[PDB]
Design a protein around this ligand. Sequence first.
Ligand SMILES: Nc1nc2c(ncn2[C@@H]2O[C@H](COP(=O)(O)OP(=O)(O)OP(=O)(O)O)[C@@H](O)[C@H]2O)c(=O)[nH]1
Ligand SMILES: [Mg+2]
Lengths: 180, 18, 415, 137
Amino acid sequence: GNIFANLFKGLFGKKEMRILMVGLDAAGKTTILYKLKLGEIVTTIPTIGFNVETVEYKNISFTVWDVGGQDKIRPLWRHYFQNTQGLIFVVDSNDRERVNEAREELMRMLAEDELRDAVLLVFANKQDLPNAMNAAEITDKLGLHSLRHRNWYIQATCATSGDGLYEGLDWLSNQLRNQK
Amino acid sequence: DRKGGSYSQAAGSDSAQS
Amino acid sequence: SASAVYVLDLKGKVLICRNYRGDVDMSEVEHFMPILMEKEEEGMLSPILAHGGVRFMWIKHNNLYLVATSKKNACVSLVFSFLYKVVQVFSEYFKELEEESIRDNFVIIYELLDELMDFGYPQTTDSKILQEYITQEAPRPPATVTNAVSWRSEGIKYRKNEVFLDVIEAVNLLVSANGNVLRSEIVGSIKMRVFLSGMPELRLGLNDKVLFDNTGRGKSKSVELEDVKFHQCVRLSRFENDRTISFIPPDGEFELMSYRLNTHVKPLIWIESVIEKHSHSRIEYMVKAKSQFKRRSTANNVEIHIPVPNDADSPKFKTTVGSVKWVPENSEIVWSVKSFPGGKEYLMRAHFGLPSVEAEDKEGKPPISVKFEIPYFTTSGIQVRYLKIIEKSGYQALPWVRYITQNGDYQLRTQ
Amino acid sequence: SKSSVIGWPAVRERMRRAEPAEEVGFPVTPQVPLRPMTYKAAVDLSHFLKEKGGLEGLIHSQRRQDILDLWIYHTQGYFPDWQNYTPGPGVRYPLTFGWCYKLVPVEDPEREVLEWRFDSRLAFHHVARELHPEYFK
Ligand SMILES: Nc1nc2c(ncn2[C@@H]2O[C@H](COP(=O)(O)OP(=O)(O)OP(=O)(O)O)[C@@H](O)[C@H]2O)c(=O)[nH]1
Ligand SMILES: [Mg+2]
């Protein structure tokens, strides 16, 4: 066999990769996806179904599949676990009562043997109110250090501002890609 | 070169302040 | 609330007029010239005139005075700001400010005047944005004017993303004739020429004393800028919250921020001058200049203006370093030095004649002004920390910045 | 870094000479980049100092710290602001994340004797940021 075509494609960039968008309802998932794809804060109704989009950055097409946090849609996340390479979780620090539910949902989703190659991606959403905690208090409460064989990275992004999205994208690219 | 001081590259942010 | 903005000429001819409200008759401009002549000849000349119930508030340009008629109690500050914006727009569109372009670019000038202000209320003043709707060589107006971002046109694409900064320093020293400096203030000037692709949101970061104190790093060299004047693109709320300098740079050269703080350090140049002027016989100029600046910095094009006698003639200059020339038009001795190394000491011994007959009236004592400009020297010690260039598409910027030190209101009071 | 290695012995000798307890202007090197030290750069500098020695256990002094910061800025272009210590009394953690150097008591925090001690957990745990969240923003 010959791999000249593959080498030529890789000389200018061939890898695209995938990504997932999960989190509770009203957690900034749709707004975050709109900012990543378009670059504006688009106001959307609650995600009854799901949103699928792609992000072109660093020569990698980061396809994002937004998933809502509805009670009837929480168990529907197993459909997206098939043919999925990435997983990004958006936390809601503005909902103290919903923090426990979000942690339980993350533990339930992380307790699947099929979803093992998807690295952890914790997004500090709703980083605009004074009630939001730091990048370690939320992680300490969720116990992200207790995930054996899991590569998790905590990143805080402000929905109104958009700061830290580039850092999160760079971290995801560095975790997915093991080349120069 | 340029009169009045050669142009110098600028940083992106305070890396030491996190 | 200007009634009619008009452009006059040096002979009193109105180069162009454009009424905005019509509350003032166009014939009132005839009395403006005699009123200005009377005010100047009686010392009552002011930028704001008054022809009965109509006030003529305007400033004098390079070749003509832009007189804007008004009748009600309109905002004089608003009128001055509109005049300044119009002057800037004319300078951007026309490289020269003279009557040669007024009579040659009327087709575009009239359109610009009509579009800029309506009913005495200006609406659009960005020259770069305005160049996309009115041209001298018409499509729909750009969405930038209607959109919130009126200083960053969308869709701009460049092969490279290079931003050139210019930290221009202005050393202004008000030294009295007794040898003491009264007004010693340094005003920073951060002028940047942003040339990138898209609409990046610059995140300016410097070594401010307030920022260092807030972050807890108030122990190193931090600039204590008393006044900071951000540009229109800079968000006032971000600076007010936590000193966050976040703004969208425009396409071209513009002033982002203008620092201004008092200076309590020694002068960069110390001038010791003597006046051995004989009573209608001769004159001596024992001028000695001591450079108090750092030896590592060189003051390129040092021009210490020494006011010589107005009626002095047959002058002789006995200096040490630098070309000394007396300009009869300026009536002063120009101590011109090409390169002045820091710590240098120049000694001069002037000698000029004077007529035996005394002058009819006194001429005063003009102050000695130095025109030193030492580049790559930051007297205030303020250093740029970072510049967060963020773009939605994602690109690697190559920002650049240079520090230039010059003398501003650095005049020395004569004895 | 050959220049850093060469400057390490002279810098250590100058710091030792200065006890534990003239020219005006702010010249700038033409074209020399100036920016705050990065976390990776701070970690590398701390590792190099630990390997070379002379900084671990040295009595903390304002003059020695200023000389070290000036030497680091001259040899690397790093702003002399990342070498800050947390306020006392007690152990002072580095202000810049990634720095492996910290001040610990050797016996008012000003009169307390402090010595530089290596700390690998500093590059991984933001002790200074946690202690002073307001100072870290
Ligand atoms: N004002 C403001 N609201 C935010 C911010 N971050 C998150 N939100 C809230 O989060 C919600 C985001 O909802 P969407 O953008 O539609 O996507 P989502 O987070 O997945 O919500 P669902 O569609 O219900 O699952 C908004 O309705 C906001 O109320 C923020 O930074 N500022
Ligand atoms: Mg949504």
